[PDB]
Design a protein around this motif. Structure first.
Motif, PDB file in Angstrom:
ATOM      1  N   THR A 131       3.350 -11.228   5.182  1.00 32.35           N
ATOM      2  CA  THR A 131       3.555 -11.004   3.758  1.00 32.35           C
ATOM      3  C   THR A 131       5.027 -11.167   3.411  1.00 32.35           C
ATOM      4  OG1 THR A 131       3.896  -8.637   4.068  1.00 32.35           O
ATOM      5  CG2 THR A 131       1.622  -9.374   3.646  1.00 32.35           C
ATOM      6  N   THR A 132       5.294 -11.669   2.216  1.00 34.85           N
ATOM      7  CA  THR A 132       6.659 -11.660   1.712  1.00 34.85           C
ATOM      8  C   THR A 132       6.779 -10.864   0.424  1.00 34.85           C
ATOM      9  OG1 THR A 132       6.422 -13.757   0.506  1.00 34.85           O
ATOM     10  CG2 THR A 132       7.108 -13.879   2.823  1.00 34.85           C
ATOM     11  N   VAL A 133       5.682 -10.265  -0.042  1.00 38.51           N
ATOM     12  CA  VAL A 133       5.609  -9.366  -1.197  1.00 38.51           C
ATOM     13  C   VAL A 133       4.525  -8.341  -0.876  1.00 38.51           C
ATOM     14  CG1 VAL A 133       6.327 -11.208  -2.807  1.00 38.51           C
ATOM     15  CG2 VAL A 133       3.876 -10.753  -2.403  1.00 38.51           C
ATOM     16  N   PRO A 134       4.402  -7.237  -1.620  1.00 33.63           N
ATOM     17  CA  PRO A 134       3.208  -6.395  -1.458  1.00 33.63           C
ATOM     18  C   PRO A 134       1.971  -7.171  -1.898  1.00 33.63           C
ATOM     19  CG  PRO A 134       4.921  -5.284  -2.762  1.00 33.63           C
ATOM     20  CD  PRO A 134       5.289  -6.735  -2.684  1.00 33.63           C
ATOM     21  N   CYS A 135       0.883  -7.044  -1.138  1.00 30.58           N
ATOM     22  CA  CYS A 135      -0.372  -7.746  -1.435  1.00 30.58           C
ATOM     23  C   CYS A 135      -1.548  -6.774  -1.442  1.00 30.58           C
ATOM     24  CB  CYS A 135      -0.614  -8.872  -0.426  1.00 30.58           C
ATOM     25  SG  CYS A 135       0.683 -10.160  -0.328  1.00 30.58           S
ATOM     26  N   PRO A 136      -1.510  -5.733  -2.286  1.00 31.35           N
ATOM     27  CA  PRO A 136      -2.586  -4.724  -2.237  1.00 31.35           C
ATOM     28  C   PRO A 136      -3.965  -5.277  -2.539  1.00 31.35           C
ATOM     29  CG  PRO A 136      -1.172  -4.381  -4.149  1.00 31.35           C
ATOM     30  CD  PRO A 136      -0.485  -5.397  -3.285  1.00 31.35           C
ATOM     31  N   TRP A 137      -4.073  -6.403  -3.254  1.00 30.77           N
ATOM     32  CA  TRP A 137      -5.387  -7.001  -3.472  1.00 30.77           C
ATOM     33  C   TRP A 137      -6.020  -7.530  -2.184  1.00 30.77           C
ATOM     34  CZ3 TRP A 137      -0.710  -9.063  -4.784  1.00 30.77           C
ATOM     35  CH2 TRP A 137      -0.383 -10.314  -4.245  1.00 30.77           C
ATOM     36  N   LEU A 138      -5.267  -7.618  -1.082  1.00 33.34           N
ATOM     37  CA  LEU A 138      -5.836  -8.011   0.205  1.00 33.34           C
ATOM     38  C   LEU A 138      -6.326  -6.826   1.031  1.00 33.34           C
ATOM     39  CD1 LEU A 138      -3.317 -10.856   1.302  1.00 33.34           C
ATOM     40  CD2 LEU A 138      -5.499 -11.028   0.080  1.00 33.34           C
ATOM     41  N   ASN A 139      -6.050  -5.596   0.598  1.00 35.31           N
ATOM     42  CA  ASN A 139      -6.535  -4.422   1.314  1.00 35.31           C
ATOM     43  C   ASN A 139      -8.055  -4.461   1.428  1.00 35.31           C
ATOM     44  OD1 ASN A 139      -3.884  -3.626   1.346  1.00 35.31           O
ATOM     45  ND2 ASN A 139      -4.108  -2.105  -0.300  1.00 35.31           N
ATOM     46  N   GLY A 140      -8.568  -4.075   2.589  1.00 32.96           N
ATOM     47  CA  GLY A 140      -9.999  -4.114   2.818  1.00 32.96           C
ATOM     48  C   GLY A 140     -10.559  -5.484   3.115  1.00 32.96           C
ATOM     49  N   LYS A 141      -9.733  -6.528   3.078  1.00 36.43           N
ATOM     50  CA  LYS A 141     -10.155  -7.880   3.416  1.00 36.43           C
ATOM     51  C   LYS A 141      -9.516  -8.415   4.687  1.00 36.43           C
ATOM     52  CE  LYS A 141     -10.489  -9.181  -1.489  1.00 36.43           C
ATOM     53  NZ  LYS A 141     -11.503  -8.120  -1.773  1.00 36.43           N
TER      54      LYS A 141
END
Length: 183
Positions: A131-141
């Motif tokens: 990651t180079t930014v926070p990616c919370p939409w990828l949590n659980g995936k």
């Protein structure tokens, strides 16, 4: 005896990539792996850094060495680890089949996190991203299993050679890799 009060998963193993860009040495990225939390995912990555498992079922060495960063998206992530076809469609784990999502407990809270790419539930192979930014939409995936502990400036250099489409503008190769034992 604790020498730091840590706000993150414990780093239990350390590995490294040496990066070349268009054949020029670009330095070393060091990673710490969260082996107390996701041991099976950490072990897969560690072994792929050393190559110690030899030849895979798809006819290529189970070894990150020589594989490219095939997708690089600025302000998102950089992705590599296709050790079989080197184009973004391939890859193989050390387990002789793609393996299950081990845990989604560790989340994509910021830059510099190591996480498994996949093609749906329980399809982990060798492909990974940073990651180079926070990616919370990828949590659980996607299963997060480590973090950059040195050389984040090299990750940023790779990121700066990306494009909106993800096609990189230079050839970025894991020129060497391995486990940090000289710890």
């Amino acid at each position: 005896f604790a020498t730091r009060v840590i706000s993150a998963p414990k780093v239990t193993k350390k590995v490294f990539f040496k990066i070349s860009i268009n054949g020029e040495d670009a330095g070393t990225i060091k990673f710490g792996l969260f082996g107390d939390d996701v041991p099976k995912t950490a072990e897969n990555f560690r072994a792929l850094c050393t190559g110690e498992k030899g030849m895979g079922k798809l006819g290529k060495p189970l070894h990150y060495k020589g594989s490219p960063f095939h997708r690089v998206i600025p302000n998102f992530m950089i992705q590599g680890g296709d050790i079989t076809s080197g184009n973004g469609y391939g890859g193989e784990s050390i387990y002789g089949s793609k393996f299950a999502d081990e845990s989604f407990k560790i989340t994509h809270d910021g830059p510099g996190l190591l996480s498994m790419a996949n093609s749906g539930p329980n399809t982990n192979g060798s492909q990974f991203f940073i990651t180079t930014v926070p990616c919370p939409w990828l949590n659980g995936k996607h299963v997060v299993f480590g973090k950059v502990i040195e050389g984040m400036e090299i990750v940023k250099k790779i990121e700066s050679l990306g494009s909106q489409s993800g096609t990189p503008k230079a050839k970025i190769i894991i020129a060497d890799c391995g486990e940090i034992t000289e710890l």
